[PDB]
Paper text:
Benzbromarone is a high-affinity hURAT1 inhibitor, which was clinically used for the treatment of gout. We determined the structure of hURAT1 in complex with benzbromarone to a resolution of 3.0 Å. In the presence of benzbromarone, the structure exhibits an inward-facing conformation, in which the extracellular vestibule is sealed and the intracellular vestibule is open. Benzbromarone binds at the urate-binding site. The ethyl-benzofuran group of benzbromarone is surrounded by C32, S35, M36, F241, and H245 of the NTD, and F360, F364, and F365 of the CTD. The dibromo-hydroxyphenyl group of benzbromarone forms hydrophobic interactions with F449. Moreover, the side chains of Q473 and N237 form polar interactions with the hydroxyl group and bromine atom of benzbromarone, respectively. In contrast, the N237A, F360T, and F364Y mutants maintained urate uptake activity similar to hURAT1WT, but all reduced the potency of benzbromarone to varying degrees. Notably, F360T had the most pronounced effect, highlighting the critical role of F360 in benzbromarone’s potency. Specifically, benzbromarone clashes with the side chain of F449 of the CTD, and verinurad clashes with R447 of the CTD of hURAT1 in the outward-facing conformation.
Author numbering: 3 to 57, 66 to 81, 85 to 95, 112 to 305, 315 to 324, 335 to 517
């Protein structure tokens, strides 16, 4: 089929336009994923005290004689002004930064604090389900078709979540949104790979990753503009209506059409792509998980690659989804994640050729994990150092993702390569699901979630030294 790609052009105006459009879509998809740390940012909250909120003393004195001291206690109040009782009358939140939030809306604080990470997990669960369902669908129905329907579902579910009346409805529609983002991601990747020459595959993968890198800054900018969770979610999910509208101009994969037997439709598609070669030419021109697991020589490589994918997913979605614990200024941290991923991913791609492939991946994972451990080790007062170290850790885990994406392909033969990549992606999605869950260990101590997030990638990088090349 590569001969047909060369005949049409392989790389050119069409490929660059498609890559730019899909990169914008991926930027908005990253905004959808990472919006939760702005639309669910826990504000400073305290029990609604009658004396503070009437239903002469300075406000400090009133807050001292109404709310007991805490590690001011955020979920207890004195029975009478100065015996403590829970927030009988509800909570009062600090709206200096964020005017509204899901935490502030459904009181996902203390007794129900777990509902905040749990919701995130549900979102990250949907992706794992979406990849499971949108995977075969793209192989049964067109890849561009599944991409278009994924865009539509993302837009609709994002709007519905932005207008969710109760918490379960919000969780359900975020699950549906994740189900759709899984399809968007998979079909964007497949469409990029299936329209560019085999030489440029690492380049297109790196550009796809830079899509998320830019999406980080896009999320920061949009959150800075919009401080209301409803309006934030609505604004983030609105552009997917336009994505759905213009996805019809994307060229469906000619490889898929030719392989499945749509010779005439694929011929028309590839002629259209070449414009921006008789049917006989195309006619002449044109590995289950059990097999991969059964081979005894690939057990170690399979396990180590899967562990690396899982480490990336777990660490990245356990850290990037809670940036308030990593630093102080959440908007600046969100910007810095992308601003460091760009150079980090470029440098990873650079060292993937001269320093090696296994050493680069191992060094990236070890640096990310050690930066996370140092961030949880340094004093809390030294906030700038903690923020910088967390930014470096996220940059390192992104670089490790680039390394593993470009590396796990070569680790397996041309026949088991797709199966190994799919297994790695599923492991990464499962790790992402587990990511937010381990934040529930923060009750035992805020240091423990970061200890886990640091000791996972460090161990994965240590085990990545056992790979062949
Ligand atoms: C570059 C890694 C990354 O950065 C993000 C920012 C916001 C939301 C999701 C991501 C995200 C992914 O989940 C991801 C997971 C797999 Br597996 C891939 O093959 C690709 Br491509 C991207």
């Amino acid at each position: 089929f590569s001969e047909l790609l060369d005949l049409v052009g392989g790389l050119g105006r069409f490929q660059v336009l498609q890559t730019m459009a899909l990169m914008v879509s991926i930027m908005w998809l990253c905004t959808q994923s990472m919006l939760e740390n702005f639309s669910a940012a826990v504000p400073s909250h305290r029990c609604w005290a009658p004396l503070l909120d009437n239903s002469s003393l300075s406000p400090e004195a009133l807050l001292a004689i109404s709310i007991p001291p805490g590690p001011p206690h955020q979920c207890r109040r004195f029975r009478q002004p100065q015996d403590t009782e829970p927030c009988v009358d509800g909570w009062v939140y600090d709206r200096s930064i964020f005017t509204s939030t899901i935490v502030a809306k459904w009181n996902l604080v203390c007794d129900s604090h777990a509902l905040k990470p749990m919701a995130q997990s549900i979102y990250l669960a949907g992706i794992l389900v979406g990849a499971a369902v949108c995977g075969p669908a793209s192989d049964r129905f067109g890849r561009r078709l599944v991409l278009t329907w994924s865009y539509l579902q993302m837009a609709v579910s994002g709007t519905a979540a932005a207008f969710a009346p109760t918490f379960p409805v919000y969780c359900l529609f975020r699950f549906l949104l994740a189900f759709a983002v899984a399809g968007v991601m998979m079909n964007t990747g497949t469409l990029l790979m299936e329209w560019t020459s085999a030489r440029a595959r690492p380049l297109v993968m790196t550009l796809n990753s830079l899509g998320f890198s830019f999406g980080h800054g896009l999320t920061a900018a949009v959150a800075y503009g919009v401080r209301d969770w409803t309006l934030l979610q609505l604004a983030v999910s609105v552009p997917f209506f336009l994505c759905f509208l213009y996805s019809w101009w994307l060229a469906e994969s000619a490889r898929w059409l030719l392989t499945t037997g749509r010779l005439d439709r694929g011929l028309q598609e590839l002629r259209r792509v070449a414009a921006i070669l008789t049917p006989e030419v195309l006619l002449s021109a044109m590995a289950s998980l059990g097999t991969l697991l059964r081979t005894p020589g690939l057990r170690l490589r399979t396990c180590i690659s899967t562990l690396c994918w899982f480490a990336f997913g777990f660490t990245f979605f356990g850290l990037a989804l809670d940036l308030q614990a990593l630093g102080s200024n959440i908007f600046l941290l969100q910007v810095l994640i992308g601003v460091v991923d760009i150079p980090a991913k470029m440098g990873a791609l650079l060292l993937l050729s001269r320093l090696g492939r296994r050493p680069t991946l191992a060094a990236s994972l070890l640096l990310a994990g050690l930066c996370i451990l140092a961030n949880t080790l340094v004093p809390h007062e030294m906030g700038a150092l903690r923020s910088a170290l967390a930014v470096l850790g996220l940059g390192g885990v992104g670089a490790a993702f680039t390394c593993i994406t470009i590396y796990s392909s070569e680790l397996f033969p041309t026949v088991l390569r797709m199966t190994a990549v799919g297994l790695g992606q599923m492991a990464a999605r499962g790790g992402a699901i587990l990511g937010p869950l381990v934040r529930l260990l923060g009750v035992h101590g805020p240091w423990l979630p970061l200890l886990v997030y640091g000791t996972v990638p460090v161990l994965s990088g240590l085990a990545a030294l056992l790979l062949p090349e």
